Design an enzyme around this catalytic site. Structure first.
Site, PDB file in Angstrom:
ATOM      1  N   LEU A  16      24.943  12.916  -8.380  1.00  0.00           N
ATOM      2  CA  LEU A  16      25.016  14.123  -7.578  1.00  0.00           C
ATOM      3  C   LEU A  16      26.440  14.297  -7.014  1.00  0.00           C
ATOM      4  O   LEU A  16      27.000  15.394  -7.073  1.00  0.00           O
ATOM      5  CB  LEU A  16      23.952  14.132  -6.469  1.00  0.00           C
ATOM      6  CG  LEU A  16      23.801  15.435  -5.670  1.00  0.00           C
ATOM      7  CD1 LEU A  16      23.386  16.577  -6.582  1.00  0.00           C
ATOM      8  CD2 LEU A  16      22.851  15.335  -4.465  1.00  0.00           C
ATOM      9  N   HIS A  50      15.596  17.132   0.367  1.00  0.00           N
ATOM     10  CA  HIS A  50      14.532  16.774  -0.562  1.00  0.00           C
ATOM     11  C   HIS A  50      13.258  17.511  -0.205  1.00  0.00           C
ATOM     12  O   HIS A  50      12.214  17.331  -0.844  1.00  0.00           O
ATOM     13  CB  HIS A  50      14.307  15.259  -0.583  1.00  0.00           C
ATOM     14  CG  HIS A  50      15.307  14.519  -1.398  1.00  0.00           C
ATOM     15  ND1 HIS A  50      15.334  14.581  -2.784  1.00  0.00           N
ATOM     16  CD2 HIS A  50      16.328  13.687  -1.048  1.00  0.00           C
ATOM     17  CE1 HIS A  50      16.318  13.822  -3.232  1.00  0.00           C
ATOM     18  NE2 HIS A  50      16.930  13.277  -2.214  1.00  0.00           N
ATOM     19  N   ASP A  70       6.385 -14.387  15.027  1.00  0.00           N
ATOM     20  CA  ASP A  70       7.049 -14.000  16.278  1.00  0.00           C
ATOM     21  C   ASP A  70       7.915 -15.134  16.820  1.00  0.00           C
ATOM     22  O   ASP A  70       9.035 -14.936  17.286  1.00  0.00           O
ATOM     23  CB  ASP A  70       6.024 -13.671  17.380  1.00  0.00           C
ATOM     24  CG  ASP A  70       5.243 -12.414  17.105  1.00  0.00           C
ATOM     25  OD1 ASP A  70       5.733 -11.578  16.331  1.00  0.00           O
ATOM     26  OD2 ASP A  70       4.151 -12.249  17.700  1.00  0.00           O
ATOM     27  N   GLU A 107      -1.257  -7.383  20.046  1.00  0.00           N
ATOM     28  CA  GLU A 107      -0.493  -6.149  19.886  1.00  0.00           C
ATOM     29  C   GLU A 107      -0.233  -5.389  21.189  1.00  0.00           C
ATOM     30  O   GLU A 107       0.912  -4.990  21.468  1.00  0.00           O
ATOM     31  CB  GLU A 107      -1.165  -5.237  18.855  1.00  0.00           C
ATOM     32  CG  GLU A 107      -1.090  -5.815  17.457  1.00  0.00           C
ATOM     33  CD  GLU A 107       0.330  -6.172  17.113  1.00  0.00           C
ATOM     34  OE1 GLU A 107       1.232  -5.342  17.403  1.00  0.00           O
ATOM     35  OE2 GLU A 107       0.558  -7.252  16.541  1.00  0.00           O
ATOM     36  N   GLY A 122      19.984   6.105  -6.894  1.00  0.00           N
ATOM     37  CA  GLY A 122      19.434   7.184  -6.091  1.00  0.00           C
ATOM     38  C   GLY A 122      20.283   7.590  -4.894  1.00  0.00           C
ATOM     39  O   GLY A 122      19.944   8.548  -4.193  1.00  0.00           O
ATOM     40  N   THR A 123      21.381   6.871  -4.657  1.00  0.00           N
ATOM     41  CA  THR A 123      22.299   7.179  -3.556  1.00  0.00           C
ATOM     42  C   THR A 123      23.119   8.411  -3.886  1.00  0.00           C
ATOM     43  O   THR A 123      24.049   8.782  -3.169  1.00  0.00           O
ATOM     44  CB  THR A 123      23.261   6.026  -3.286  1.00  0.00           C
ATOM     45  OG1 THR A 123      23.953   5.696  -4.495  1.00  0.00           O
ATOM     46  CG2 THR A 123      22.502   4.822  -2.775  1.00  0.00           C
ATOM     47  N   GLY A 124      22.758   9.034  -4.999  1.00  0.00           N
ATOM     48  CA  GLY A 124      23.320  10.307  -5.394  1.00  0.00           C
ATOM     49  C   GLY A 124      24.700  10.121  -5.964  1.00  0.00           C
ATOM     50  O   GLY A 124      25.587  10.939  -5.733  1.00  0.00           O
TER      51      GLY A 124
HETATM   52  C1  NHX Z   1      -2.274 -10.687  15.892  1.00  0.00           C
HETATM   53  C2  NHX Z   1      -1.502 -11.348  14.726  1.00  0.00           C
HETATM   54  C3  NHX Z   1      -2.440 -11.853  13.585  1.00  0.00           C
HETATM   55  C4  NHX Z   1      -0.323 -10.449  14.272  1.00  0.00           C
HETATM   56  C5  NHX Z   1       0.610 -11.186  13.249  1.00  0.00           C
HETATM   57  C6  NHX Z   1       1.950 -10.466  13.101  1.00  0.00           C
HETATM   58  C7  NHX Z   1       2.377 -10.186  14.512  1.00  0.00           C
HETATM   59  O1  NHX Z   1       3.059 -10.987  15.197  1.00  0.00           O
HETATM   60  N1  NHX Z   1       2.155  -8.954  14.898  1.00  0.00           N
HETATM   61  O2  NHX Z   1       2.558  -8.731  16.203  1.00  0.00           O
HETATM   62  C8  NHX Z   1       0.064 -11.391  11.845  1.00  0.00           C
HETATM   63  O3  NHX Z   1      -0.628 -10.515  11.328  1.00  0.00           O
HETATM   64  N2  NHX Z   1       0.333 -12.529  11.217  1.00  0.00           N
HETATM   65  C9  NHX Z   1      -0.250 -12.627   9.868  1.00  0.00           C
HETATM   66  C10 NHX Z   1       0.792 -13.122   8.841  1.00  0.00           C
HETATM   67  C11 NHX Z   1       1.243 -14.569   9.021  1.00  0.00           C
HETATM   68  C12 NHX Z   1       2.412 -15.008   8.402  1.00  0.00           C
HETATM   69  C13 NHX Z   1       2.767 -16.349   8.556  1.00  0.00           C
HETATM   70  C14 NHX Z   1       1.979 -17.231   9.294  1.00  0.00           C
HETATM   71  C15 NHX Z   1       2.365 -18.555   9.435  1.00  0.00           C
HETATM   72  C16 NHX Z   1       1.580 -19.432  10.159  1.00  0.00           C
HETATM   73  C17 NHX Z   1       0.408 -18.995  10.745  1.00  0.00           C
HETATM   74  C18 NHX Z   1       0.023 -17.672  10.606  1.00  0.00           C
HETATM   75  C19 NHX Z   1       0.812 -16.788   9.885  1.00  0.00           C
HETATM   76  C20 NHX Z   1       0.446 -15.460   9.739  1.00  0.00           C
HETATM   77  C21 NHX Z   1      -1.509 -13.520   9.794  1.00  0.00           C
HETATM   78  O4  NHX Z   1      -1.742 -14.419  10.614  1.00  0.00           O
HETATM   79  N3  NHX Z   1      -2.259 -13.287   8.715  1.00  0.00           N
HETATM   80  C22 NHX Z   1      -3.511 -14.037   8.469  1.00  0.00           C
HETATM   81  C23 NHX Z   1      -4.436 -13.118   7.697  1.00  0.00           C
HETATM   82  C24 NHX Z   1      -3.336 -15.307   7.620  1.00  0.00           C
HETATM   83  N4  NHX Z   1      -2.112 -15.502   7.137  1.00  0.00           N
HETATM   84  O5  NHX Z   1      -4.302 -16.039   7.388  1.00  0.00           O
HETATM   85 ZN    ZN Z   2       3.157 -10.467  17.271  1.00  0.00          ZN
END
Ligand code: NHX
Ligand code: ZN
Ligand code: NHX
Ligand code: ZN
EC number: 3.4.24.-
Lengths: 427, 427
Positions: free
Chosen positions: B54, B179, B336, B260, B49-51
């Site tokens: 094209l 596009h 994070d 957030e 798709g990088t064309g």
């Molecule tokens: C405010 C926060 C939740 C926001 C955070 C993302 C963030 O930094 N936004 O700024 C988020 O959405 N994390 C998810 C996904 C995740 C991935 C790996 C993990 C490893 C260890 C512990 C928890 C983990 C969670 C989550 O926690 N998801 C839940 C549903 C879970 N996995 O049970």
């Molecule tokens: Zn976060």
């Protein structure tokens, strides 16, 4: 057309070895008479374009003797029996025209699981078939010396190799002259500087370079290939085209300028640098925002502790300049830092260049030394890199004004030649 | 329909390289006359798709020359001999219509253990068969450049590659415009912001984005595609659909909001952040309860120590806000924390961004340093991450009231735009 060694460049070692072959061809009796037996099969080893076919022809032409050029890729895809019949014919035509040379190009294409057995074996029979005293010698070229069936390497056949080594600067110069025979070169063209600037280049690389310079002149419908075309052709071949596409902001262009001017200043000021040839702020190929070309003047085989310390300081010149001028260093120097750390480790761990650690090879069997020695190594490595760094920052502080001039010019013109650079640093 | 380079977006480097080809096509003599030989086979490399097809057409249309489009997947499944016959025909039709361009799409489907040998070899013969001076040039596209038989890569055939690099923001902008030629766009549609918001996107990704925005408008039986459709189409393509299904309790929604709002505040307050574009508390795709979109404004190639320190603080903003507001931190910030620890390690171990450790690359050969250095690294890593953390908690304490307002709005509306966010933080 007839060819001699005067038509092959940068393979003096191989040609000297091949000088005996020429003689044996010229007068087989001189050997036969006292039992100095020749190899029936000689194998020239090296990458494609190193003139391994040119050399063969050069050996026949140098003894004024027939040359039967054959390719090992022609026998692949042949009908059942045809592959073996071709070989039987070739040698029949050789014994009659002897003394001669029988060449087999891309032999690793035939000497390598069906009809390729018949043709290969048929070769093995023809080898075992002819009389070496007749003045007949089979050669073959292969950049793929390991794919070959061990049978061909057994005494009586291809049991000799003549090593075709990559050319030095003077060998590259001659190869360029040769590939430049039928090209319209401007007067400003200096093959010596182009040879200096292509260390590691072999014949086929040099031939491509010449073509690339021609594509460059043709692009502008010009009739003479110029030094500009060559220098640009080198830069494209090594570091790719010039990405005049991407948009770099003024602030990042300053940092890039300073960084590069940093390398060049420190490299020039320091006693053992290779002289700077060019500084460019023009992006090139896969993530290369700027760079400093050097123009060697040597062909050196030894390197000293002071020369590595000076090279290390220069490698840290980019980052030194960032630190000194901006305060806030960037990720740009990561590759510099890795290259520098690598030299220091090597000085300390292989070259015996630290006093604490002595003339000992630590390492190699992988790491095979205590944790106590491991920390002395790091300590010595840190202390070498750090001193070359402070030393670079001091060169930056002392030549600040000329450094300022250099980035000012660079930001305007994007390129500055080493002569101009040496001129700005000499008050 | 006729196509030129004005119909291909974001491939300037490749198009500049291809500019010589256009010329050689336009007037072969200008090259032939001084021995500037052209490649017989050019290989364009990049994802689908990088064309890349094209581009081929664009090179012929840019020199007003015939274009023979062929597919390498058509020759798979052909009868014995048919595959080779097609190739012989194609080139016969090319020599007659020369100068021209012969294209071979999905070449890695043919240049790859039976009849595929005949067709492939037949290609290898046709290549070796035509005269480059005739102004004929074969191209081919392949996102699968390694599956190719090394024979096709040998001088005389496909011995040149022109790199088709992924587009910058301005290249993505043009690809979108292209596009978007035959699409009804609302006036509120800003392709520049959509281009900014799709870094890493290639042409085929951008085309799918445009389609996804259309599926979004069609779903509501509307006749114009709106900025909402584009922004939502981006979010779906990257982070999946919007899981308005799952049931999140009020207490967890508060923590998510604060978390957030934390990122967004700290990111805005800190000097080097990329500006916040949007904050959402709406779950999306595989376990993503909330997130903060940024809208870049650059195309930067260097990153500084302060910029990484600021980005690190922001990455810790979520957890900082949890700690400060609730006392009891949650598992939410795990990703994070891992991202932040990773940056600090990299600063300390690759970028030479700690003073203790110096401008040394520790690591790379895997870990190759003493236990003493290992603990200094950890100590430096901890101290960087910890300072950016305290610094984040201080931003939280100082903008507590506006932080409170932001989560209050977010809990009610679930989304807040960056403008509104900057407005709430400016007293
Ligand atoms: C405010 C926060 C939740 C926001 C955070 C993302 C963030 O930094 N936004 O700024 C988020 O959405 N994390 C998810 C996904 C995740 C991935 C790996 C993990 C490893 C260890 C512990 C928890 C983990 C969670 C989550 O926690 N998801 C839940 C549903 C879970 N996995 O049970
Ligand atoms: Zn976060
Ligand atoms: C003044 C400097 C930039 C000059 C520098 C080369 C130099 O020493 N000239 O003297 C450079 O061009 N680096 C590139 C390539 C690169 C390779 C590996 C990296 C690893 C970690 C961090 C940054 C990395 C950058 C770059 O940074 N390239 C940018 C485009 C990038 N990769 O984003
Ligand atoms: Zn550098």
């Amino acid at each position: 057309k007839r060819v001699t060694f005067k038509d092959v460049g940068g393979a003096e070692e191989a040609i000297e070895e091949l000088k005996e072959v020429v003689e044996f061809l010229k007068d087989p009796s001189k050997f036969n008479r006292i039992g100095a037996r020749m190899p029936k099969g000689i194998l020239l080893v090296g990458p494609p374009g190193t003139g391994a076919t040119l050399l063969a022809r050069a050996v026949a032409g140098e003894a004024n003797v027939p040359f039967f050029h054959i390719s090992g890729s022609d026998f692949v895809e042949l009908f059942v029996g045809v592959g073996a019949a071709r070989v039987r014919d070739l040698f029949a035509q050789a014994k009659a025209h002897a003394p001669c040379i029988v060449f087999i190009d891309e032999i690793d294409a035939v000497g390598r699981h069906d009809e390729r057995e018949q043709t290969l074996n048929q070769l093995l029979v023809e080898m075992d078939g002819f009389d070496s005293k007749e003045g007949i010698i089979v050669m073959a070229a292969t950049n793929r010396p390991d794919i070959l069936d061990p049978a061909l390497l057994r005494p009586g056949r291809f049991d000799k190799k003549i090593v075709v080594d990559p050319p030095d600067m003077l060998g590259r110069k001659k190869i360029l002259e040769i590939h430049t025979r039928n090209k319209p070169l401007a007067e400003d063209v200096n093959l010596e500087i182009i040879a200096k600037r292509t260390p590691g280049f072999v014949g086929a690389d040099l031939e491509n370079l010449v073509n690339e310079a021609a594509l460059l002149a043709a692009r502008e419908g010009r009739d003479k290939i110029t030094m500009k075309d060559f220098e640009e052709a080198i830069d494209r071949v090594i570091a790719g085209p010039a990405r005049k596409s991407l948009l770099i902001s003024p602030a990042e262009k300053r940092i890039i300028a300073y960084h590069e001017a940093g390398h060049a200043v420190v490299s020039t000021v320091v006693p053992n640098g290779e002289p700077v040839h060019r500084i460019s702020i023009i992006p090139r190929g896969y993530k290369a925002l700027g760079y400093t070309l050097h123009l060697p003047e040597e062909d050196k085989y030894l390197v000293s502790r002071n020369e590595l310390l000076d090279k290390l300081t220069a490698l840290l010149g980019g980052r030194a300049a960032e630190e000194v001028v901006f305060g806030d260093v960037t990720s740009g120097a990561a590759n510099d830092i890795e290259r520098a750390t690598e030299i220091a480790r090597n000085m300390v761990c292989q070259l015996g260049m630290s006093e604490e650690l002595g003339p000992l090879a630590w390492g190699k069997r992988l790491r095979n030394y205590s944790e106590e020695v491991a920390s002395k190594i790091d300590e010595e490595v840190k202390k070498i890199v750090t001193n070359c760094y402070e030393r670079a920052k001091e060169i930056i502080r002392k030549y600040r004004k000329q450094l300022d001039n250099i980035v000012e010019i660079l930001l305007e013109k994007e390129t500055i030649e080493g002569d101009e650079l040496r001129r700005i640093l000499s008050e």
